[PDB]
Amino acid sequence: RGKWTYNGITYEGR
């Protein structure tokens, strides 16, 4: 979902 960030771990899925 666009970009997800949590726990300091960034996740740029789409």
Question: What is each CA distance from 8 to 1, 4, 5, 11, in whole angstroms?
Answer: 17, 10, 7, 10
The first and second tokens of residue 8, run together, are 């300091």
Is residue 2 within 8 A of residue 11, CB to CB? The reply is: no
Residues 13, 7, 1, CA angle at the centre, nearest 5°? 20
At residue 2, φ and ψ (nearest 5 deg) are 65, -80
- The whole-angstrom separation of Cα 13 and Cα 6 is 13
Alpha carbon distances (Å) from 5 to 10, 12, 13: 4, 8, 10
- Long-range CB pairs of 4-8 (<8 Å, 24+ gap) are none
Map residue 10 onto helix, strand or coil. strand
Can you tell me whether residue 12 is helix, strand or coil? coil
Method: NMR
